[PDB]
Amino acid sequence: VQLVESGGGLVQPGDSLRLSCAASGRTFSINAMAWFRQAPGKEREYVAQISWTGGNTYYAESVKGRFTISRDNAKNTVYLQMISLKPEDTAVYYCAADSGGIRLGASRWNYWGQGTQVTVSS
Amino acid sequence: SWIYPTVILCLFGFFSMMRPSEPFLIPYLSGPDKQLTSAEITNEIFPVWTYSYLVLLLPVFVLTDYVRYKPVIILQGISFIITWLLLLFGQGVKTMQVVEFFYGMVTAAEVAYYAYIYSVVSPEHYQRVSGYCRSVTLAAYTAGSVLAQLLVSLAQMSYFYLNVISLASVSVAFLFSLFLPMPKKSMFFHAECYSSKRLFYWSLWWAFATAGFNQVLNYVQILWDYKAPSQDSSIYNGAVEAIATFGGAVAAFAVGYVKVNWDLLGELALVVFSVVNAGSLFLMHYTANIWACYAGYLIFKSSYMLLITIAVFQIAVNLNVERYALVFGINTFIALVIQTIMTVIVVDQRGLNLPVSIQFLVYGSYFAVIAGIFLMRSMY
Ligand SMILES: Cc1cnc(Nc2ccc(OCCN3CCCC3)cc2)nc1Nc1cccc(S(=O)(=O)NC(C)(C)C)c1
């Protein structure tokens, strides 16, 4: 799968942002997708998780209550709606698909996205 | 003549049962190593153990006696290595279901460990040698759990480097398994009783009580991780699992020490201590405190072992050694049918898909309905 992101940018505090993730190419075997975050001078941080076959979501405690991750199998896209933004969120947001099968690896997530920039400030 | 097969079999039992990573499983599975959502572990992966154990129980029991007990002990040692190689490097939800299947083999193949000794030792040196082999299994898992906590706490050892010690331990276990003498007779191949009032009655409480016990111990580390996530606060899984294992051992030992006739005090003692299991299962569910949830686990495990001992003692009072195998083999299979039906309806994703928060309100009430049925059965 080739995950390409969209919808980043600079938004003041209190404004929203929806980020997309168009998975394509081998989309037949996807059983979970996630969003990660890498703020400046830090490491990748879990932000959310959505199951493909079902719809069960799972959010990081810090971002829960204002982040919502939804699937759109019809078009194979994944969304992340972020509300009540504050200047401490600015990062680069990455997609991560756990494609499927019996695998040996270091990370649950096989393929990763390029990254989309959120610059919350004024 | 009896010291060589027991020394090699006790060394296999000690090293195969020493696995520091066992208490820190859900903390490991739901961590940064194999990050898996709690609902994915409880409702998708874990059910696969009871499904696979149920299927691979009769074939392995018949296989263990057809070919000698040794061939199947070596199979158990292999399944130990495969399980911990996938538990270390395997990723995804579907690989963890394969790990559940291979642990069903590990649990279904332990019949040959205890059955092996009977066919390689004289009848007189059986109860004594059967005690040596059973006690070395408890000492290994109680010492292994204590080692896990003493590293995770005073040494800050990662959960990943506890499965490496578990893999190193079971790899040594599958080195003595190749050195045990090959038996020259089985029990049945190469070598109606339920009509008794006591044996059928005592087998039903055993089968029903043990089925719930396996269910409770199954989704118990999930409960602990729910009341106190491992990534936020300190979790004493290793110290709790060691004390509970030690406490259960003393409960079984004390049952055989006090000389009380289990006929005028046999049914009452199984309703009083079955109520304690229900009372201890609601506490684990209704309490926000993690320490009170640990204490409920101690009382449940200690209390249960105090009756499976009384139930087993009463079952095996007139049966031969040859009839223990095919009477405790049926009861272990009936308990799995009970466990599978409860797992399909309650925990399975295709069933009710209940989370672990509400599950213990069912397990706690499960033990309360067994006590009432065995108290309301005394009708006049
Ligand atoms: C390597 C591994 C792979 N899959 C699993 N899944 C699993 C989790 C809990 C299980 O308990 C069901 C009831 N048990 C009660 C004792 C016998 C079975 C059975 C299987 N556990 C694993 N290790 C494990 C971790 C914590 C506890 C247990 S256990 O209580 O079931 N078995 C002993 C550790 C006592 C040997 C086993």
Pocket residues: Cβ below 6 A from ligand 1: B 22, 25, 46, 49, 83, 87, 99-100, 103, 141, 214, 217-218
Phi, psi for A6 (deg, rounded to 5): -160, 165
Strands A77-82 vs A17-22: parallel, antiparallel or unpaired: antiparallel
In angstroms, what separates the C-alpha of B90 from chain A's closest C-alpha? 4
Which is nearest to B312 in space by CA: B187, B207, B164, B162?
Answer: B207
Which is nearest to A32 in space by CA: A46, A47, A18, A53?
Answer: A53
Q: Is the dihedral of CA A99, A104, A108, A113 positive or negative?
A: negative
Query: Which class is B192-380 in CATH?
Result: mainly alpha
Place of tokens 């399909």: B344
Q: Do B91 and A106 touch (CB under 8 A)?
A: yes
Place of tokens 């600015």: A90
**Is B37 near chain A, with CB under 8 Å?**
yes
Which is nearest to B204 in space by CA: B339, B54, B334, B9?
Answer: B334
A 8-27 → B contacts, CB under 8 A: none
Distances (CA, A) of A30 to A1, A3, A49, A74: 9, 12, 13, 13
Nearest-CA residue for ligand 1 atom 4 is: B100
Where is chain B discontinuous (C–N over 2.5 Å), named by the preceding residue?
A: 191
Phi, psi for B258 (deg, rounded to 5): -65, 130
Phi-psi region of A41 (alpha: psi -120 to 50; beta: other; left: phi over 0): left
In angstroms, what separates the C-alpha of A56 from chain B's closest C-alpha? 8
Per DSSP, B182 falls in state: P
User: CA-CA distance, A16 to A34, in Å (whole number)?
Assistant: 19
User: CA-CA distance, B22 to B149, in Å (whole number)?
Assistant: 11
User: CA-CA distance, A72 to A19, in Å (whole number)?
Assistant: 13
**Helix-then-strand count for chain B, H and E:** 17, 1
Q: Calculate ∠ Cα B226-A43-A22, nearest 5°.
A: 85
User: CA-CA distance, B12 to B172, in Å (whole number)?
Assistant: 8
CB B65 within 8 A of CB B189: yes
Cα of B218 vs centre of ligand 1, distance in Å, is: 7
Which is nearest to B328 in space by CA: B210, B168, B180, B231?
Answer: B210
Distant-in-sequence, close-in-space partners of A41: CB < 8 Å, separation ≥ 6: none
Ligand 1 atom with the smallest distance to the CA of B166 is 1
Distances (CA, A) of B376 to B260, B271, B309: 24, 11, 23
* Number of neighbours of residue A26 by Cβ within 10 angstroms: 13
Structure tokens at A23: 């998975």
Collapsed DSSP state (helix, strand, coil) of residue A103: strand
User: CA-CA distance, B80 to B170, in Å (whole number)?
Assistant: 6
Structure tokens at B356: 């672990």
Which is nearest to B6 in space by CA: B192, B136, B142, B156?
Answer: B136
CB A19 within 8 A of CB A5: yes
Q: Tabulate helix, strand, coil % of chain B (nearest 5).
A: 75, 0, 25
Structure tokens at A118: 């959120």
Of B37, B92, B98, the CB nearest to A58: B37
User: CA-CA distance, B249 to B251, in Å (whole number)?
Assistant: 5
**Is B100 near chain A, with CB under 8 Å?**
no
Cα of B39 vs centre of ligand 1, distance in Å, is: 18
Distant-in-sequence, close-in-space partners of B171: CB < 8 Å, separation ≥ 6: B81
User: CA-CA distance, B335 to B332, in Å (whole number)?
Assistant: 5
Tally of residues, chain A = 122
Strands A116-118 vs A33-38: parallel, antiparallel or unpaired: unpaired
* Number of neighbours of residue B77 by Cβ within 10 angstroms: 23
User: CA-CA distance, B234 to B154, in Å (whole number)?
Assistant: 12
Domain boundaries, given as residue ranges, for chain B: 1-191, 192-380
Which is nearest to B106 in space by CA: B40, B58, B60, B156?
Answer: B60
Q: Does an H or E element contain A70, and which?
A: strand A67-72
Place of tokens 């111990």: B217
Given 2.40.160.20, 3.40.630.30, 1.20.1250.20, 2.60.40.10, which CATH number is that of B1-191? 1.20.1250.20
**Is B353 near chain A, with CB under 8 Å?**
no
Which is nearest to B157 in space by CA: B23, B250, B262?
Answer: B23
CB B90 within 8 A of CB B167: no
Q: Do A104 and B91 touch (CB under 8 A)?
A: yes
Residue A32 identity: A
Residue A54 identity: G
Which is nearest to B50 in space by CA: B363, B331, B360, B343?
Answer: B343
Name the strands in the sheet holding A4-6, side by side, starting at the edge strand that comes first in the sequence: A4-6, A17-22, A77-82, A67-72
Q: Do B92 and A100 touch (CB under 8 A)?
A: yes
User: CA-CA distance, B90 to B79, in Å (whole number)?
Assistant: 15
Collapsed DSSP state (helix, strand, coil) of residue A121: coil
Phi, psi for B329 (deg, rounded to 5): -85, -35
CATH number for the segment(s) A4-118: 2.60.40.10
